[PDB]
C-alpha cells in the first residue's frame, strides 16, 4: 500500500474528530 | 518459460492440421473428414474404408504430426471450450 | 438404489484374457515442506481397464472417472487432481498392484486466472500492470508421474486399500507442489 | 462483490431494459428528487424564530403544537413554480406521494430482480432495426448488447464448459 | 451560539478583523507557496530534463515559476539544461523564501489588524457604523488590478524590464523564456500564440484601469445598488466567488486543452496532443524528410531526439494516470533512461506492421498489428487454439531504429511480443523502476492534476457563487420567512402582480 | 461570538467523518 | 440497401434459381418456426462447430450450399461428411413422426427455408454463422 | 455500461456517496412519508384521512412525538427536530449528488478510481488470489473490447475474433 | 496497518452505541 496511507486516514478522522470534541467540550461547559 | 501453446503455434501445428493436437472440431475445414474421419484421426503423416483412404490422401498435404501435454490433456483433443 | 443414496461416493481367492470393469477408489496425508474441504467429490469410480496375464497381471487402465479435484486443509488449502488417469498396473489373485499413473496440471490450459492469464486462452502478459511477473506470466503446464500400491478381500469383484502418492496443483508453475499421499480404500469388479 | 452482482446481472438479464428496474430508478430518482423537493420546500417556509446568529433549526422546540413552516407559502412557492395545481397543497397527500413514490418505485424495482430470477429478462432490442436489403442497423440497444456480451463472455471465465449460459 | 459552519461570520460588521482573517489566509497560501516550491526543490531531480522534466516529477509549483520566467537555482541548476549559472536572486529557492517571507509578513500584518480592528476608517462618519463603501474600494482595487496588469504585460512579459515568460516550439524542443512582443491583429486571441497572452495584459490592463477610474468617481444607479444589495459585502463575495470559478474553469480548460500560458516543457503533453497522434505525424514528418534525402532508416531515426519521441508515449498522457495513483508520473512507468527506439513491426514477409496504439481510454488494449491498407494482419490472441492471427503464426519481427537498440532485429516471438506491449504505448522507452518503486501503473500530470482540482474547486465555487447570491438576495429571509406573512399574499389572484401588495 | 455544537452534531459529525474514512481509507492506502 | 435479384440470385443444384421477396419473407418464418430454435442467426446452438455459413455448408458432403442441397437435406439429413445419417436427431420430412414442426412443409416451402439460408449470409455477413463475437 | 468498463465508476468513491445519497434520499422519501402519513392526528371522521386537512390551520397535521418515539426504539435513534430532519431531506440527495459531479469531472481527466494498486500488485504475482475487485475488473475488459468497435466507429477498432477476451465455452 | 485500521469501524459501532444510548433526550417543549 501507499505508506503515508494510514498518516492520510488518521489525519482524516481524527483531525475533524479532535475539531468537533474541541466544539463539544467548550459547548458543554456554559 | 514459454508458453508451450503458442510454441505450439509457431511450428506446423499453427499452420494446418496438426494430427496429434487440433481439435476434433478442425476437421471441418476440409471434406469428408468431419466426423467420422475425424473420429477415427483423433482417438508420421494417417492410413480403414477404401472411400475413407480416398478422402485422406487427398487430404494428407493438409495434414501434420508434430503431442503437446496441454493442447490434449483433459479431453481437449475433443472439446477444447471453443465454441462460436 | 439411487434414491435411498442421494453412499455414491462409496466403494462397496480368485484365479486367459481378463479385465477389470468397475474400479472405485475411496480415499491424503500431504507433506509438510488435513481435512476435506472438498465435502466428499473426492472418489473415483467406474473404471474399466485390461487385466493382461503375463505370472502378474498387467493392469492397464483405459477409461472411467478417474480423476477427482480435491482441495485439502494443512490453513493452507492445498488442491490435488486425485486421479489414476492412464494407470497401467501389475501384480490366482489372492497380491499387490505396483502402478504408476500420471497426473496432469489441476487446471487444464483453458483455465483463465484472475488476471486473465492462462495457458491456451487469455493474456499472456499482465495487463494489470502496464509498464512493469514472468512466472505468475507464463503458465507452465506439469504432467508429473504418481505411483500407487493398491493392496488386494476377494469374491470376481474383489476389494481392499490403495495409497498412491502424488504431487499437488503446481499452479500451472506458480508454486511449489506438496506430496500429498493419498490412503484409501478400493474396489475392483473383474469379469472376462 | 454487490458490482460484481450488478454487472453479471445485466450481461444475463439486460436489466437496465427491463421497465421494472425503470421503475425503481423512476422510484429512487424520484424519491431523491421529492426527498430534496420536500426538504428544500418546508426549509424554505420556514418561519423566522430565531436570530441569524444562532441556527434556524432551534426555532422547533419538540412536540411543539404550531407548525414549524407555512406550508401555504410552500404551495404557495412550489406552485408558482410549475402551476398551481402540480402541487400538493395537502401536506397528508403530499407525505402520502412521498411515501409511495419510492416505495412502489422499489417495489416494482424488486420485483425486477424477482422476475429476472425465472430469467424474464429485460428488453431484448437486439438486431431490431433492419433496413430494405436486411441489413442490422444497429441501435443504442446495440450497443449495449456488444457491453452485455462482454461481461457475459468474461463472467465466470472458467465455469462454464457448454456455450448457452442458461442459469 | 454560533454553528461550527457559522463561525466566520463574526467578520461581516468587523471590516478590520475581515482584513485580518484576509491577511492571514494571504499569509496561508504565500506560506504554501513557498513551502510547496521548497519541497519540489528538495525532490525535484534537474539533471535530465529531456527525459524527467518537471511534469514528470509530479512538480506542480515549479511550472509555474518556470513559465514567468524562474530559471535557476542558487544550487546551480537551470531547468534549460545547463549547470553552473547564478541566477541572481531570483531562483528556485529565492522565489520560495520571498513567499515564506511574505508569509510571516502577513502573519505580522494580520495580528495587527486582528487586534486594532477599530479603525475609524472602518466606521461610516453619518451613522458610527463599521461601513465599507464597496464601490469605492472595487475601482481602488480595479485601478490597481490593471496597473499590475498593464506593468506585467508591459514590462515583465514584454521582457523591456522583466524575464519575458516560456516560449516554445510547437512540439516543445527547445522551448526556453524568451521577451514576447504583443500580438495587436486577431492573431492574438489565438490562445497558443504568446504574443496575445502579453497583449491581453497590456490592453486589459488598461481597461481595468480605466474601468478603475470609472468605479472610483461613479456611484452606482439607485436601482444597481438595491437589486445587488451593493451596501451587503455577500454580494461581493457572491460575484466574486462567481468570477473565481468562471475563472478557475477558464484554467482548467487552457491546462487541459493546452495554451501558450501551460506549455508542454513545464506541465506535460495534452491529452489531445496523444488523441491526434500530433507527436506520431510530427515523428514521420522528420523521418520522411530524410527518407527523400537518402538517408536510411537507422540513420533517419537515430536524429529524432529523444525528448520528441517522449512526447509520443502514452505514460505521458494526462487522461491516463488514476484519481488515487498517487504522485509522480516517475512512480508508474518510472524514471525514462533512454529511449529503445522505434519498433518496426516486420512479418515473416516482411511487410511492414503498425501497432494499434492504446486510446487514453483503455486500461487494456489488445496488441494488434495493421499495414498500411489498414487490414489486421497479425495480433497478440486472447484465445490461442483456434488463432489465425499470432506472431508465431505471421513471423512477425520487430526492428528498432534510433535510440538504444539502434539496429538490433529481435525475430523470436515472445521478445516480439513484449515490445509490441509497450508498442502499443507509443515510442518505447527504458524506464529506472528502481529510483521511486515505479509500479507500472501509469500516473497524471501537473496539467492533469490542476485541471482536476481547478474543474473540481470551480464546480465547488459555483455551489458557493448560489448559496451566497441566495444569502445576498434573501438577506432578511435566512432566519426565516414572515409569521406575519399573509396567507392572501401566496394566494393565487389576490394580487395581480406577484410579491406586490399594492396590486390586490 | 461562542460557538455552539450540540451532541447529535458532535455525533453525526462524527459519523460523517468516520464512514467518510472507512470509504476512502480503501483508496488512501490505494 | 435494398433487397434485389442480385441478393435473390443463389445457386439452385451449376444454375442459380431467384427468390422472390413474397419467398424469402415466407422462408425466414419458415426458418424462425422450425429451424431457428437450434440455428439461430446461423450458428448451431447444439453444435457449435456446425454453423449454417455457404462455406461450411459448400464443403459438407455432399455440398449444401445449393438450395436442391438444403432440401435434400431437409429430406434426408445426413452428418458433414454424409456418412452416418441422423433423421432421428434432426428435423427432417423422413421425421415427421418425431419432429412434429416439418409435417407442414411442402415442396415450394423448403425451397423457402433453402432459399433463407443462402440469401441471409449475403445480407448479414460474417454474422450469419458467425455467433455472439458478430453481433 | 461504458463507466463501468471503461472508468470502473462503480468503484471509485464519489460515485458512492452518490449512491449513499439518492438512495438516502429515496430512504428518506420513503421514511419521512410513511411516518407523517402512520402518526397523523385523527381530525376526520372518515376513514381517508386526506380530508382531514385544510392548509390555512396551523396545527401539525402528525405526531411528531410519537414519531419520534416510534423511530426510537425501531431504529435507535429519531429526528426530534422537524427542521433538522427536513433540511437532512435537503442535504442527503444534494450532497451524494454533488459528490457524483466531483467523480465524474475526475473521469473527464480519466482519473478513475480505477484499481487499487496494492491488490493488482497482490493478483500479478499470485494467481490464485482472486476477490470480486479482479472480477470486476475481467468484467470491464469484456466491457472495453467488445462493446467499443461499435461504440467507437471512429477509431476504426478491428478487433479480430480472437483477441477478444472470453472466459471459456463463451 | 491495513486490517486494524479497517477495523474505524470499530468506533462506528461505539458511536452507534453512543448516539443510541447516551443521545441528549428528546424533550417535550
Ligand atoms: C486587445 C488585445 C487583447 C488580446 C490579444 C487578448 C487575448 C486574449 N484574451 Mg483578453 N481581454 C482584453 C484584451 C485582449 N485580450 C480586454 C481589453 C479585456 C476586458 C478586460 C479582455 C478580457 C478577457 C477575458 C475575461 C478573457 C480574456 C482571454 C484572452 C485569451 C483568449 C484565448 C483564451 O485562452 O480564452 C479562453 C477563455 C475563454 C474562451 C472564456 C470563455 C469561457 C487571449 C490571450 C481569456 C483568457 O484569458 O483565457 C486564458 C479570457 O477568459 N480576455
Ligand atoms: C508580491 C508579489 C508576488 C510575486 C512577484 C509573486 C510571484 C509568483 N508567485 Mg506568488 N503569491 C503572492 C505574491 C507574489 N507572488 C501572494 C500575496 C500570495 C498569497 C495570495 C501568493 C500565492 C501564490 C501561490 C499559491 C503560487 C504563487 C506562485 C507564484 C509564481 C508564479 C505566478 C503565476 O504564474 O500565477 C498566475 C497568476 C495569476 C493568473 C494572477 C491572477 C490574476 C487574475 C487573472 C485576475 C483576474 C481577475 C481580475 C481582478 C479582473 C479584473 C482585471 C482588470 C485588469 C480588467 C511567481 C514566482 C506559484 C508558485 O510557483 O509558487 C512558488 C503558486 O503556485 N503565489
Ligand atoms: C491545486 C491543488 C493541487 C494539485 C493539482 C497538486 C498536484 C500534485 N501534488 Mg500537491 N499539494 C497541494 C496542492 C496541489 N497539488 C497542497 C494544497 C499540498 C499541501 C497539503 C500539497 C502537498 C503535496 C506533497 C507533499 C506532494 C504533492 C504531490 C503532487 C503531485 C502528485 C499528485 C498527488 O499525489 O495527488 C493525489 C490527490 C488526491 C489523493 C486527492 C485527494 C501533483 C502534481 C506529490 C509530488 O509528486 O511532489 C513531487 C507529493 O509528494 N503535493
Ligand atoms: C472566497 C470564498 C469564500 C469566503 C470568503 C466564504 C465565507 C463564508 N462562507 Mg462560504 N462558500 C464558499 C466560498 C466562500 N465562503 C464555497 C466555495 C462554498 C461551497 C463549498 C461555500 C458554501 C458555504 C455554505 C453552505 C455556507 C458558507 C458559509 C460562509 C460564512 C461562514 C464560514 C465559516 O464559518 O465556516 C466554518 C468552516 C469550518 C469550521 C471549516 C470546515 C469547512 C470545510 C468542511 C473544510 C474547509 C476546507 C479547508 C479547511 C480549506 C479549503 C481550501 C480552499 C482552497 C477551498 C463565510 C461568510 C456559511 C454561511 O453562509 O453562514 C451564514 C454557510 O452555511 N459557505
Ligand atoms: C443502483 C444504485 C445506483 C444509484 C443510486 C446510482 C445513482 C447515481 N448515479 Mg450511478 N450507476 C450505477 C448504480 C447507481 N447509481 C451503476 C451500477 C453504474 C455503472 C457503473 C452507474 C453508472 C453511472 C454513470 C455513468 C453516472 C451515474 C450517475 C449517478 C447519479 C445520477 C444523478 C442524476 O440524477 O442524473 C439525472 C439527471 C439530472 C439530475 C439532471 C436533470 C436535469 C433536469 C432537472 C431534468 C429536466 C428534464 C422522456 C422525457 C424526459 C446518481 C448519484 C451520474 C453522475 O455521476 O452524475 C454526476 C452519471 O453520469 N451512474
Ligand atoms: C463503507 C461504507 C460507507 C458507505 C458510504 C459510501 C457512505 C457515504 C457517506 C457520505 C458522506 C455520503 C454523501 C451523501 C450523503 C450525505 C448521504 C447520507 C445518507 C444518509 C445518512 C441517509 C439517512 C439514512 C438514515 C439512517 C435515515 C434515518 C431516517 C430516520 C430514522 C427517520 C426517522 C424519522 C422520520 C420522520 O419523518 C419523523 C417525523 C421522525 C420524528 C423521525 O424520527
Ligand atoms: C489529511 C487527509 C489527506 C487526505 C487526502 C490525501 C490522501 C493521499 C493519500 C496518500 O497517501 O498520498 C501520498 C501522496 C505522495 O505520494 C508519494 O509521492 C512521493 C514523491 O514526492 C513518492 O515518490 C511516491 O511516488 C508517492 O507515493 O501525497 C500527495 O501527493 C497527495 C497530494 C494532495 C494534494 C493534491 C490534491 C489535488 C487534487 C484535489
Ligand atoms: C481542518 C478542518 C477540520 C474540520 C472539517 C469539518 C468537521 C466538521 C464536519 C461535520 C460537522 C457536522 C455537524 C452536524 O452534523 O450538524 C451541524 C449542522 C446542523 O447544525 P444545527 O442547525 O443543528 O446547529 C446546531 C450546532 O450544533 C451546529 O454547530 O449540520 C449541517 O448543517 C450539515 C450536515 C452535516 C452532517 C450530515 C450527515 C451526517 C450523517
Ligand atoms: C399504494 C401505496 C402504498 C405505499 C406504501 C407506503 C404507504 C405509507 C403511507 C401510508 O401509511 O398510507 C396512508 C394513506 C392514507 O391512508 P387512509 O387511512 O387514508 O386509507 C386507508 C383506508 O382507511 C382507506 O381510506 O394510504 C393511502 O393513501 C392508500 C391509497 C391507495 C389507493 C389504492
Ligand atoms: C442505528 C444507529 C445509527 C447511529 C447514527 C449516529 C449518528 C448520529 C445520530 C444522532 O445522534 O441523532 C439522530 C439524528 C436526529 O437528531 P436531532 O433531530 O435531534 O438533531 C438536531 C440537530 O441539532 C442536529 O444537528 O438523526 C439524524 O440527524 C440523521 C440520521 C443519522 C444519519
Ligand atoms: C435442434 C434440435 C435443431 C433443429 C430444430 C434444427 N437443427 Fe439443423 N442441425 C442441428 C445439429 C445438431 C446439427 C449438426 C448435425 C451433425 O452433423 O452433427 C444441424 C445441422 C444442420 C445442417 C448442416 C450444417 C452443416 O454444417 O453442414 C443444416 C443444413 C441444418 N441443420 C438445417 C436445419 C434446418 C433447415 C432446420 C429447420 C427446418 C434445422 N436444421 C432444424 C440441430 C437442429
Ligand atoms: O454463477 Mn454467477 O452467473 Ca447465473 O448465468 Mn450461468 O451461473 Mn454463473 O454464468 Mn452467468
Ligand atoms: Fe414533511
Redesign the pocket.
Known amino acids: 500500500v501507499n505508506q503515508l496511507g494510514l498518516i492520510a486516514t488518521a489525519l482524516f478522522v481524527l483531525?475533524?474528530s479532535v475539531?468537533?470534541i474541541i466544539?463539544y467540550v467548550q459547548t458543554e461547559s456554559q | 518459460l514459454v508458453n508451450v501453446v503458442d510454441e505450439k503455434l509457431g511450428t506446423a501445428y499453427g499452420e494446418k492440421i496438426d494430427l496429434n493436437n487440433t481439435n476434433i472440431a478442425a476437421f471441418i475445414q476440409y471434406r469428408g473428414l468431419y466426423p467420422t474421419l475425424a473420429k477415427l484421426i483423433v482417438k508420421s503423416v494417417v492410413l480403414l474404408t477404401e472411400r475413407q483412404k480416398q478422402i485422406l490422401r487427398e487430404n494428407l498435404e493438409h495434414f501434420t504430426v508434430t503431442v503437446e501435454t496441454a493442447l490434449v490433456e483433459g479431453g481437449d483433443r475433443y472439446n477444447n471450450g471453443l465454441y462460436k | 438404489t439411487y434414491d435411498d443414496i442421494v453412499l455414491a461416493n462409496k466403494c462397496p481367492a480368485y484365479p486367459q484374457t481378463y479385465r477389470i470393469a468397475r474400479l472405485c477408489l475411496q480415499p491424503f496425508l500431504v507433506k509438510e515442506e488435513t481435512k476435506l474441504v472438498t465435502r466428499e467429490t473426492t472418489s473415483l469410480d467406474q473404471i474399466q481397464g485390461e487385466l493382461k496375464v503375463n505370472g502378474s497381471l498387467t493392469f492397464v487402465e483405459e477409461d472411467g472417472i478417474d480423476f477427482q479435484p480435491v482441495t485439502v486443509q494443512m490453513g493452507e488449502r492445498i488442491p490435488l487432481l486425485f486421479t489414476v488417469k492412464n494407470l497401467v498396473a501389475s501384480t490366482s489373485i489372492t497380491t499387490d498392484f505396483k502402478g504408476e499413473f500420471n497426473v496432469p496440471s489441476y487446471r487444464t490450459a483453458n483455465f483463465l486466472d484472475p488476471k486473465g492469464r492462462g495457458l491456451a486462452s487469455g493474456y499472456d502478459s499482465a495487463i494489470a500492470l502496464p509498464q512493469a511477473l514472468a512466472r505468475a506470466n507464463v503458465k507452465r503446464f506439469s504432467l508429473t508421474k504418481g505411483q500407487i500400491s493398491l493392496n488386494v478381500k476377494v469374491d470376481g469383484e474383489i476389494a481392499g486399500t490403495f495409497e498412491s502418492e502424488q504431487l499437488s496443483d503446481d499452479d500451472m508453475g506458480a508454486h511449489e507442489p506438496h506430496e500429498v499421499k493419498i490412503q484409501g480404500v478400493f474396489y475392483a469388479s473383474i469379469e472376462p | 462483490g454487490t458490482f460484481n452482482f450488478m454487472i453479471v446481472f445485466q450481461a444475463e438479464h439486460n436489466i437496465l431494459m427491463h421497465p421494472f428496474h425503470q421503475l425503481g430508478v423512476a422510484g429512487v430518482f424520484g424519491g431523491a428528487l421529492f426527498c430534496a423537493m420536500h426538504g428544500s420546500l418546508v426549509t424554505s417556509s420556514l418561519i423566522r424564530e430565531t436570530t441569524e446568529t444562532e441556527?434556524?433549526?432551534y426555532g422547533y422546540k419538540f412536540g411543539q403544537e404550531e407548525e414549524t413552516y407555512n406550508i401555504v407559502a410552500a404551495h404557495g412557492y412550489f406552485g408558482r413554480l410549475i402551476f398551481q395545481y402540480a402541487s400538493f397543497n395537502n401536506s397528508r397527500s403530499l407525505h402520502f406521494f412521498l411515501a409511495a413514490w419510492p416505495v412502489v418505485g422499489v417495489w416494482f424495482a424488486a420485483l425486477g430482480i424477482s422476475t429476472m430470477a425465472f430469467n424474464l429478462n429485460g428488453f431484448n432490442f437486439n438486431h431490431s432495426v433492419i433496413d430494405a436489403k436486411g441489413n442490422v442497423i444497429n441501435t443504442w440497444a446495440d450497443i449495449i448488447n456488444r457491453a452485455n456480451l462482454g461481461m457475459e463472455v468474461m463472467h465466470e471465465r472458467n465455469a462454464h464448459n457448454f456455450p448457452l449460459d442458461l442459469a | 451560539g454560533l454553528?461550527?459552519?457559522r463561525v466566520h461570520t463574526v467578520l461581516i460588521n468587523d471590516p478590520g478583523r475581515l482584513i485580518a482573517a484576509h491577511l492571514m489566509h494571504t499569509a496561508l497560501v504565500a506560506g504554501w507557496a513557498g513551502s510547496m516550491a521548497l519541497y519540489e526543490l528538495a525532490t525535484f531531480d534537474p539533471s535530465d530534463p529531456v527525459l524527467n522534466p518537471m511534469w514528470r516529477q509530479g512538480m506542480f509549483v515549479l511550472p509555474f515559476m518556470a513559465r514567468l520566467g524562474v530559471t535557476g537555482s542558487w544550487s546551480g541548476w537551470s531547468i534549460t539544461g545547463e549547470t553552473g549559472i547564478d541566477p541572481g536572486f531570483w531562483s528556485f529557492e529565492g522565489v520560495a523564501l520571498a513567499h515564506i517571507v511574505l508569509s510571516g509578513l502577513l502573519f505580522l500584518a494580520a495580528c495587527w489588524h486582528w487586534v486594532y480592528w477599530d479603525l475609524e476608517l472602518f466606521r461610516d462618519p453619518r451613522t458610527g457604523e463599521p461601513a465599507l463603501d464597496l464601490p469605492k474600494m472595487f475601482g481602488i482595487h480595479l485601478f490597481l488590478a490593471g496597473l499590475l496588469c498593464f506593468g506585467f504585460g508591459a514590462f515583465h512579459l514584454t521582457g523591456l524590464f522583466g524575464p519575458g515568460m516560456w516560449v516554445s516550439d510547437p512540439y516543445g524542443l527547445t522551448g526556453s523564456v524568451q521577451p514576447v512582443a504583443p500580438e495587436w491583429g486577431p492573431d492574438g486571441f489565438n490562445p497558443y500564440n504568446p504574443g496575445g497572452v502579453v497583449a491581453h495584459h497590456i490592453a486589459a490592463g488598461i481597461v481595468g484601469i480605466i474601468a478603475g477610474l470609472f468605479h472610483i468617481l461613479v456611484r452606482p444607479p439607485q436601482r444597481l445598488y438595491k437589486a445587488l444589495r451593493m451596501g451587503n459585502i455577500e454580494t461581493v463575495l457572491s460575484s466574486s466567488i462567481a468570477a473565481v470559478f468562471f475563472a478557475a474553469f477558464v484554467v482548467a480548460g487552457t491546462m487541459w486543452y493546452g495554451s501558450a500560458t501551460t506549455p508542454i516543457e513545464l506541465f506535460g503533453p495534452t491529452r489531445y496532443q496523444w488523441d491526434s497522434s500530433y507527436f506520431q505525424q510530427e515523428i514521420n514528418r522528420r523521418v520522411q524528410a530524410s527518407l527523400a534525402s537518402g538517408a536510411t532508416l537507422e540513420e533517419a531515426w537515430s536524429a529524432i531526439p529523444e525528448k520528441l519521441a517522449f512526447y509520443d508515449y502514452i505514460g505521458n498522457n494526462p487522461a491516463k494516470g488514476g484519481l488515487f495513483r498517487t504522485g509522480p508520473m516517475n512512480k508508474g512507468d518510472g524514471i525514462a533512461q533512454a529511449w529503445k527506439g522505434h519498433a518496426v513491426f516486420r512479418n515473416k514477409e516482411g511487410e511492414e506492421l503498425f501497432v494499434r496504439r492504446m486510446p487514453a481510454f483503455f486500461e487494456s488494449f489488445p496488441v494488434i498489428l495493421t499495414d498500411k491498407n489498414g487490414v489486421v494482419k497479425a495480433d497478440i490472441p486472447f484465445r490461442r487454439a483456434e488463432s489465425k492471427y499470432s506472431f508465431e503464426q505471421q513471423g512477425v519481427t520487430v526492428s528498432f531504429y534510433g535510440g538504444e537498440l539502434n539496429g538490433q532485429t529481435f525475430t523470436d516471438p515472445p521478445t516480439v511480443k513484449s515490445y509490441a506491449r509497450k508498442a502499443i504505448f507509443g515510442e518505447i522507452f527504458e524506464f529506472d523502476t528502481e529510483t521511486l518503486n515505479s509500479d507500472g501503473i501509469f500516473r497524471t500530470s501537473p496539467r492533469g492534476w490542476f485541471t482536476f482540482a481547478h474543474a473540481v474547486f470551480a464546480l465547488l465555487f459555483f455551489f458557493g457563487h448560489i448559496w451566497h447570491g441566495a444569502r445576498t438576495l434573501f438577506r432578511d429571509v435566512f432566519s426565516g420567512i414572515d409569521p406575519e406573512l399573509s396567507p392572501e399574499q401566496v394566494e393565487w389572484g389576490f394580487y395581480q402582480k406577484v410579491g406586490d401588495v399594492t396590486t390586490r | 461570538q461562542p460557538?455552539?455544537?450540540?451532541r447529535?452534531?458532535?455525533y453525526?459529525?462524527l459519523?460523517?467523518?468516520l464512514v467518510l474514512a472507512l470509504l476512502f481509507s480503501s483508496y488512501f492506502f490505494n | 440497401a435494398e433487397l434485389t435479384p442480385e441478393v435473390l440470385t443463389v445457386p439452385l443444384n451449376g444454375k442459380t434459381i431467384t427468390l422472390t421477396e413474397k419467398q424469402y419473407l415466407e422462408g425466414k418464418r419458415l426458418f424462425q418456426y422450425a429451424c431457428a430454435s437450434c440455428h439461430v442467426g446461423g450458428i448451431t446452438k447444439t453444435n457449435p462447430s456446425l454453423d449454417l455459413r455457404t462455406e461450411t455448408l459448400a464443403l459438407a458432403t455432399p455440398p449444401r450450399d445449393n438450395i436442391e442441397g438444403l432440401v435434400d437435406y431437409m429430406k434426408n439429413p445426413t452428418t458433414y461428411d454424409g456418412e452416418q445419417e441422423i433423421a432421428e436427431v434432426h428435423p427432417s420430412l423422413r421425421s415427421a413422426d418425431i419432429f412434429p414442426k416439418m409435417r407442414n412443409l411442402t415442396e415450394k416451402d423448403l425451397v423457402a427455408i433453402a432459399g433463407h439460408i443462402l440469401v441471409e449470409p449475403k445480407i448479414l455477413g460474417d454474422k450469419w454463422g458467425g455467433g455472439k463475437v458478430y453481433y | 455500461l461504458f463507466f463501468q468498463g471503461f472508468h470502473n465508476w462503480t468503484l471509485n468513491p464519489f460515485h458512492m456517496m452518490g449512491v449513499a445519497g439518492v438512495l438516502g434520499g429515496a430512504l428518506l422519501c420513503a421514511i419521512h412519508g410513511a411516518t407523517v402519513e402512520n402518526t397523523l392526528f385523527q381530525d376526520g371522521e372518515g376513514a381517508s384521512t386526506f380530508r382531514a386537512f385544510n392548509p390555512t390551520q396551523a396545527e401539525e397535521t402528525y405526531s411528531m412525538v410519537t414519531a419520534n418515539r416510534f423511530w426510537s426504539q425501531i431504529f435507535g435513534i429519531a429526528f426530534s427536530?422537524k427542521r433538522?430532519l427536513h433540511?437532512?431531506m435537503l442535504?442527503?440527495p444534494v450532497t451524494g449528488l454533488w459528490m457524483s459531479a466531483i467523480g465524474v469531472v475526475g473521469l473527464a481527466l480519466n482519473l478513475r478510481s480505477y484499481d487499487f494498486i496494492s491488490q493488482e500488485i497482490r493478483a500479478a504475482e499470485d494467481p490464485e488470489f482472486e476477490t470480486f475487485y479482479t472480477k470486476n475488473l475481467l468484467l470491464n475488459e469484456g466491457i472495453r473490447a467488445w462493446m467499443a468497435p461499435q461504440d467507437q466507429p471512429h477509431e476504426n477498432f478491428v478487433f479480430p475474433e480472437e483477441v477478444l477476451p472470453r472466459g471459456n465455452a463463451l | 496497518m491495513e486490517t486494524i485500521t479497517y477495523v474505524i469501524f470499530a468506533c462506528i459501532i461505539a458511536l452507534f452505541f453512543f448516539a443510541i444510548f447516551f443521545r441528549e433526550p428528546p424533550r417535550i417543549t
Open positions: 483531525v475533524p475539531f468537533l466544539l | 441556527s434556524a433549526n | 454553528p461550527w459552519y | 460557538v455552539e455544537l450540540n447529535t452534531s458532535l453525526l459529525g459519523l460523517l467523518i | 427536530n433538522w433540511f437532512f442535504f442527503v
